[PDB]
Amino acid sequence: DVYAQEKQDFVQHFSQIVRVLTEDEMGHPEIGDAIARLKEVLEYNAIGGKYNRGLTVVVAFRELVEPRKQDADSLQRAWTVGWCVELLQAFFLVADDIMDSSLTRRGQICWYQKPGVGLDAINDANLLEACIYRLLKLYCREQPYYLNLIELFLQSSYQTEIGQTLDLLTAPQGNVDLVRFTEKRYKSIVKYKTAFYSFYLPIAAAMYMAGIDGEKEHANAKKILLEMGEFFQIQDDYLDLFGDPSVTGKIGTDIQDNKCSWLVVQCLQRATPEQYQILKENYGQKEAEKVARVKALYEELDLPAVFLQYEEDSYSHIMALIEQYAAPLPPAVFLGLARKIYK
Amino acid sequence: DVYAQEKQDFVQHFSQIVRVLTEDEMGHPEIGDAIARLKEVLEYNAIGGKYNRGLTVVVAFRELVEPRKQDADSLQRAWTVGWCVELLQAFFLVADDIMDSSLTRRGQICWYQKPGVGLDAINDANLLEACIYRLLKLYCREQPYYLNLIELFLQSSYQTEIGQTLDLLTAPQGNVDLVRFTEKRYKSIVKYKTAFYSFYLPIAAAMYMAGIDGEKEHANAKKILLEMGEFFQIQDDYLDLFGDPSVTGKIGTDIQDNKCSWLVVQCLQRATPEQYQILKENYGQKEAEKVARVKALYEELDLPAVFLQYEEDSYSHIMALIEQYAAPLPPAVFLGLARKIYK
Ligand SMILES: Cc1ccc(-c2cc3c(N[C@H](Cc4ccccc4)P(=O)(O)O)ncnc3s2)cc1Cl
Ligand SMILES: Cc1ccc(-c2cc3c(N[C@H](Cc4ccccc4)P(=O)(O)O)ncnc3s2)cc1Cl
Ligand SMILES: Cc1ccc(-c2cc3c(N[C@H](Cc4ccccc4)P(=O)(O)O)ncnc3s2)cc1Cl
Ligand SMILES: Cc1ccc(-c2cc3c(N[C@H](Cc4ccccc4)P(=O)(O)O)ncnc3s2)cc1Cl
C-alpha cells in the first residue's frame, strides 16, 4: 500500500503539528493553562485512528504533482493539510459522542466521559475545528490555493453538520419510527454526513494544492468520490452486524441505537406486514433476544446475499465512473481508494 | 443614538438573511427537513438581544466610508456582516448555555432546555457558526476584503474559545477554589472570552469593508477597543449584584455560580484571613443567606465605592487612548461606543 509506506512520516509530523499550535505560550504567558488543555485535547482525540482520510491527502498530492515541484516545504504542507482533515474528523467525533451518549471510541473512554471533562468537551471540540484554520494560516497563507482550502474545509464542515441534522431528525433515539427510514433519506444522510468529508474533501484538497482548481475537474472527481462514500458506509452498516468482530475491530450496536442503517432500509423494502411488526417490536431495544430476533429476520430475508449482489453492482459502477470522469487525473488516484474499501 | 435609528433596517434585513440561508431547498429537495430545522435555530437564537455588536458594524461603516461609496449593495453587505457578528454571538451562547447548565437566556427557555432539542443543540450551535461563512461567500466573495473578513471571524472564534477554556479551568462549578481567582487571570479571561469579539471584531469588520486593512491601524483600534471591553465586563459584574434588576434587565447569579467576577477578585485583594474564610464558606452556594452574606461583605469592604473610582479612572484612560490611537479614524467611531457603555 502507497498508504502503509507514508504512514510513518505522517504520524511523526503530528509532534510538530502540536509544537506549533502550542507555540504562543512563548507569545502570551497569560493563556498557558488553556494551551496545556488544548495539547491534551489534540493528543487524546487526533491520535488512535487508521488516518485513512489524512494519508489520502498526502498520497494524492504525490500522484498529482510532477516530482520536480515536490520540495521539502511542499511535503510539509501536504502533511499539515492531511492532519487538518484528521482534526476536522476529531472535532465531529468528540461532538457526535456527546450527542449519541456513546461510551467508547477507537476502543477508548470517549473524551466527554473522562473525569473532569464532561460538557467542557463542547469547547474542546470547537478548539479542534479552530486548529484547522490556524494550521492553514501558518503553513499555506502565502500559497495561491490558500482561500480555496479555507472554503473547502468550511463547506465540508457545513455539509457534515447538515447531514448530522438530517440524521438526528430521522433517528430520535427513544423514538422507534421506521416510516422515516427510506432509501432516498438513507442516501442523503450518507452523502452529507460521511461522503463529502471522507472521500471528496481529502482528494479535493490535494487537487487545489496541485494547481487543479477548475470547477469541472472538481465536479468530475466529486461524482466518483461521493459514490465511493455511499458504498463505504453501506459496507460499514453490513459489517456492524455480520462483520467478524476480530476482523472489523468493533462490535455493532446499530440495532440497539435505532440507526437508519442500510440493513433496516432494505429489510423494510422487503418485509410483509407480519415482519414489519416483529421489527417494530424489536428494533431499538437493548435486550439481546430482541436483537438476535432482528439479525435472524435480516438472515431469513437473505440480506447478506442482497449485499454481495450490491457489492458486485457497486464495483462495476465505480469502475465505469472512473473510466468516464477520472481524466485528466491519474486513474490511480481513485483506484488506490477503491482498493482500500473494496478490501 | 445613531444606533436607535438604523435598528429598524437591521432587524428587517434578518428576514432576508434567513430567506437566503434556506434557499437551497429549491436546490436540493433531499435536505429540506434539515433546512426547516436550521430556520427554527436562527429564528429562536439570533433574535431577541439588543443587537449592539451587529449595529456597531453598520454605524462604523457609515462613519468610515465617504458617502459616495455607500450604494444600496454596500449597505446590504454592512447589514449582512453585522448579522454575521450576531450569529457568532448566538453560536457561543447556545453552546455556553449547555456547558453552564443555564435555564434561561434573554428571559426565554435556553434552546437546549426545549422539549426534543437537548444535546442536539450542539450541532445546532455548529450550524450557526457555519452560517457566518455561507453569508460571507454569498454577499462578499467578489469583494477585495473577502479573505480579510474570513480570517477575522475565524481568529475571533479562536480567541473566544481560548477565553472559554481559561474560564472553565479557572471556575469549575462544584469546586470552590479562590486561589486561581487573580487580577492577571480575570483580565486574560475578559480579553479573550468577551473583548475581542464584542469590541474589536465589529469595528475591525467595518475597517476592512472600508479599505482600511493596515496592521498599525488595526493594532491602534485594538488597543482602544480591548480596554473598552475590559471596562464593559467589569461593569457587567458590578451590576450582576448591585444593578437595579428592573434597570439592567436581569437578576445576578454570579455568586451562586462561583464566577471569577471582578467583585470577588477585588474582595480577595482586600480581605483579612477571617474574611477569606467567611467567603470560602459562602461563595458558590445556592442558599440566599450565604449569598446575602457575601453581598454584605462586599458592602463592608466598600466595593461600590472601589467601582465608582475605577469607573472614573477608566473613563480618563479610554479618552487618552482615543486621543492617542484613534487617528486617522473619526474619534466618533470610538466615542459612540464609549457612550453606549459608560451610560
Ligand atoms: C477515505 C477512506 C476512509 C476510510 C477507509 C477505511 C477505513 C477502514 C477501517 N476503519 C475503522 C472503522 C471501520 C471498521 C470496519 C469497516 C469500516 C470502517 P476505524 O479506522 O477504527 O475508524 N477499518 C478497516 N478498513 C478500513 S478502510 C479508507 C479510506 Cl481510503
Ligand atoms: C480497485 C480494486 C477493487 C477491488 C479489488 C478486489 C476486491 C476483491 C475482493 N473483495 C471482497 C468482496 C468483494 C466481492 C466481490 C466484488 C468485490 C469485492 P472483500 O475482501 O470481502 O471486501 N475479493 C476477491 N477479489 C477482490 S479484488 C481489487 C482492486 Cl485493484
Ligand atoms: C459592543 C457593545 C456591547 C454591548 C453593549 C451594551 C449592552 C447592553 C445591555 N445588554 C444586556 C446585558 C447587559 C445588562 C446590563 C449591563 C450590561 C449588559 P443584553 O442586550 O440583554 O445582553 N444592556 C444595557 N446596556 C447595554 S450596552 C454595547 C456595545 Cl457598543
Ligand atoms: C463618551 C461619553 C462617555 C460617558 C459620558 C457620560 C457618562 C455619564 C454618567 N455615567 C454614569 C456613571 C459614571 C460616573 C462617572 C464617570 C463616568 C460614568 P452611569 O449612567 O451610572 O453609567 N453620569 C453622568 N454624566 C455622564 S456623561 C458621556 C459621553 Cl459623551
Side-chain angles (χ1 to χ4, degrees), chain A residues 2-4 6-7 9-25 27-49 51-65 67 70-175 177-183 185-215 217-249 251-273 275-279 282-284 286-289 291-292 294-299 301-339 341-342, chain B residues 2-4 6-7 9-25 27-49 51-65 67 70-175 177-183 185-215 217-249 251-273 275-279 282-284 286-289 291-292 294-299 301-339 341-342:
Chain A
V2 54
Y3 285 74
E6 323 216 19
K7 169 138 176 201
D9 273 326
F10 191 71
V11 174
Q12 184 62 99
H13 188 74
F14 187 66
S15 185
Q16 194 189 248
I17 289 310
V18 173
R19 184 177 314 112
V20 172
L21 288 177
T22 63
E23 205 127 38
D24 306 13
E25 316 201 49
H28 298 286
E30 49 181 10
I31 54 157
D33 285 11
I35 297 291
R37 163 63 171 244
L38 178 54
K39 184 165 178 178
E40 239 194 316
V41 170
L42 290 163
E43 306 263 45
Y44 192 100
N45 289 296
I47 298 300
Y51 315 110
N52 290 306
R53 286 166 188 84
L55 285 168
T56 293
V57 173
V58 171
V59 167
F61 174 70
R62 284 190 167 284
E63 287 170 359
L64 277 176
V65 164
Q70 305 179 21
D71 50 10
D73 284 353
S74 266
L75 289 163
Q76 187 92 349
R77 293 189 285 263
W79 288 329
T80 292
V81 171
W83 273 112
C84 286
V85 172
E86 287 294 320
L87 289 179
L88 184 68
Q89 171 167 57
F91 149 68
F92 296 153
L93 288 187
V94 166
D96 284 353
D97 288 330
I98 308 161
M99 297 183 250
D100 293 1
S101 306
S102 318
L103 290 174
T104 65
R105 164 75 62 195
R106 291 147 180 193
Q108 200 166 83
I109 293 179
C110 299
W111 173 246
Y112 84 94
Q113 291 284 21
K114 281 208 75 71
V117 175
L119 295 175
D120 287 3
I122 293 173
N123 178 59
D124 290 330
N126 289 332
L127 287 181
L128 288 166
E129 179 191 34
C131 279
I132 293 156
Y133 298 105
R134 282 193 70 213
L135 288 178
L136 290 177
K137 175 153 113 204
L138 269 153
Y139 282 94
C140 311
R141 61 184 194 281
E142 304 287 59
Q143 308 297 320
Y145 53 71
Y146 180 47
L147 178 53
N148 279 332
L149 287 192
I150 289 169
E151 285 198 327
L152 177 58
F153 273 93
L154 290 168
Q155 167 171 232
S156 290
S157 296
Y158 177 70
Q159 310 249 44
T160 304
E161 290 157 7
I162 290 288
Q164 182 54 17
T165 305
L166 204 35
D167 191 30
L168 292 179
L169 294 169
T170 307
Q173 52 176 239
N175 219 340
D177 204 341
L178 310 169
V179 139
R180 44 192 156 202
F181 280 4
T182 79
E183 180 126 50
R185 168 57 61 93
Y186 176 80
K187 274 197 222 274
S188 315
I189 294 177
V190 169
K191 178 163 156 225
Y192 285 86
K193 194 186 145 141
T194 297
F196 198 92
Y197 98 92
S198 298
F199 291 85
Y200 174 65
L201 158 61
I203 297 296
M207 290 175 64
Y208 285 121
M209 296 190 71
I212 319 177
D213 66 351
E215 285 193 284
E217 277 90 32
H218 281 273
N220 284 346
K222 177 175 294 169
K223 199 159 158 51
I224 299 167
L225 288 166
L226 290 179
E227 182 85 31
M228 286 182 31
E230 192 169 278
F231 169 80
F232 174 75
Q233 186 61 52
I234 293 190
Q235 170 170 249
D236 234 82
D237 303 357
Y238 176 80
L239 286 181
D240 186 274
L241 194 51
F242 293 113
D244 196 78
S246 26
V247 161
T248 48
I251 320 183
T253 47
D254 287 351
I255 301 148
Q256 299 88 326
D257 306 336
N258 182 56
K259 313 282 198 188
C260 196
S261 152
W262 183 81
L263 274 170
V264 294
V265 166
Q266 293 297 325
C267 181
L268 292 155
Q269 270 182 28
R270 278 174 178 77
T272 57
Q275 300 190 305
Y276 187 100
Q277 283 286 343
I278 291 169
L279 182 67
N282 290 294
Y283 202 64
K286 208 161 59 200
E287 301 96 12
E289 91 253 23
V291 151
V294 182
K295 173 144 177 160
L297 168 66
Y298 286 176
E299 279 180 0
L301 287 186
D302 312 304
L303 289 202
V306 169
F307 175 65
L308 187 78
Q309 190 65 66
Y310 172 81
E311 189 164 18
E312 293 163 18
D313 302 328
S314 177
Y315 182 58
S316 308
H317 180 52
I318 300 294
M319 287 310 181
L321 287 167
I322 292 184
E323 288 165 80
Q324 200 177 348
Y325 292 109
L329 310 179
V333 165
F334 300 105
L335 290 177
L337 298 170
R339 176 148 143 105
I341 82 188
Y342 286 91
Chain B
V2 54
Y3 285 74
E6 323 216 19
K7 169 138 176 201
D9 273 326
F10 191 71
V11 174
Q12 184 62 99
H13 188 74
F14 187 66
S15 185
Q16 194 189 248
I17 289 310
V18 173
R19 184 177 314 112
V20 172
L21 288 177
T22 63
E23 205 127 38
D24 306 13
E25 316 201 49
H28 298 286
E30 49 181 10
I31 54 157
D33 285 11
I35 297 291
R37 163 63 171 244
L38 178 54
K39 184 165 178 178
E40 239 194 316
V41 170
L42 290 163
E43 306 263 45
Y44 192 100
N45 289 296
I47 298 300
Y51 315 110
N52 290 306
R53 286 166 188 84
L55 285 168
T56 293
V57 173
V58 171
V59 167
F61 174 70
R62 284 190 167 284
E63 287 170 359
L64 277 176
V65 164
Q70 305 179 21
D71 50 10
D73 284 353
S74 266
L75 289 163
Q76 187 92 349
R77 293 189 285 263
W79 288 329
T80 292
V81 171
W83 273 112
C84 286
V85 172
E86 287 294 320
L87 289 179
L88 184 68
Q89 171 167 57
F91 149 68
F92 296 153
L93 288 187
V94 166
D96 284 353
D97 288 330
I98 308 161
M99 297 183 250
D100 293 1
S101 306
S102 318
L103 290 174
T104 65
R105 164 75 62 195
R106 291 147 180 193
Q108 200 166 83
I109 293 179
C110 299
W111 173 246
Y112 84 94
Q113 291 284 21
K114 281 208 75 71
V117 175
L119 295 175
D120 287 3
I122 293 173
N123 178 59
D124 290 330
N126 289 332
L127 287 181
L128 288 166
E129 179 191 34
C131 279
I132 293 156
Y133 298 105
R134 282 193 70 213
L135 288 178
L136 290 177
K137 175 153 113 204
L138 269 153
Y139 282 94
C140 311
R141 61 184 194 281
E142 304 287 59
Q143 308 297 320
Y145 53 71
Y146 180 47
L147 178 53
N148 279 332
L149 287 192
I150 289 169
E151 285 198 327
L152 177 58
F153 273 93
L154 290 168
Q155 167 171 232
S156 290
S157 296
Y158 177 70
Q159 310 249 44
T160 304
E161 290 157 7
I162 290 288
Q164 182 54 17
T165 305
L166 204 35
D167 191 30
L168 292 179
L169 294 169
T170 307
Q173 52 176 239
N175 219 340
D177 204 341
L178 310 169
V179 139
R180 44 192 156 202
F181 280 4
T182 79
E183 180 126 50
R185 168 57 61 93
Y186 176 80
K187 274 197 222 274
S188 315
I189 294 177
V190 169
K191 178 163 156 225
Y192 285 86
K193 194 186 145 141
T194 297
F196 198 92
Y197 98 92
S198 298
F199 291 85
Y200 174 65
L201 158 61
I203 297 296
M207 290 175 64
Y208 285 121
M209 296 190 71
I212 319 177
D213 66 351
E215 285 193 284
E217 277 90 32
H218 281 273
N220 284 346
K222 177 175 294 169
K223 199 159 158 51
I224 299 167
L225 288 166
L226 290 179
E227 182 85 31
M228 286 182 31
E230 192 169 278
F231 169 80
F232 174 75
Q233 186 61 52
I234 293 190
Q235 170 170 249
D236 234 82
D237 303 357
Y238 176 80
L239 286 181
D240 186 274
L241 194 51
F242 293 113
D244 196 78
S246 26
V247 161
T248 48
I251 320 183
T253 47
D254 287 351
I255 301 148
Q256 299 88 326
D257 306 336
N258 182 56
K259 313 282 198 188
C260 196
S261 152
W262 183 81
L263 274 170
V264 294
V265 166
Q266 293 297 325
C267 181
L268 292 155
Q269 270 182 28
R270 278 174 178 77
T272 57
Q275 300 190 305
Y276 187 100
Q277 283 286 343
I278 291 169
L279 182 67
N282 290 294
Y283 202 64
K286 208 161 59 200
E287 301 96 12
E289 91 253 23
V291 151
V294 182
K295 173 144 177 160
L297 168 66
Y298 286 176
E299 279 180 0
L301 287 186
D302 312 304
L303 289 202
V306 169
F307 175 65
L308 187 78
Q309 190 65 66
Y310 172 81
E311 189 164 18
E312 293 163 18
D313 302 328
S314 177
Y315 182 58
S316 308
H317 180 52
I318 300 294
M319 287 310 181
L321 287 167
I322 292 184
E323 288 165 80
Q324 200 177 348
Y325 292 109
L329 310 179
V333 165
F334 300 105
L335 290 177
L337 298 170
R339 176 148 143 105
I341 82 188
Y342 286 91

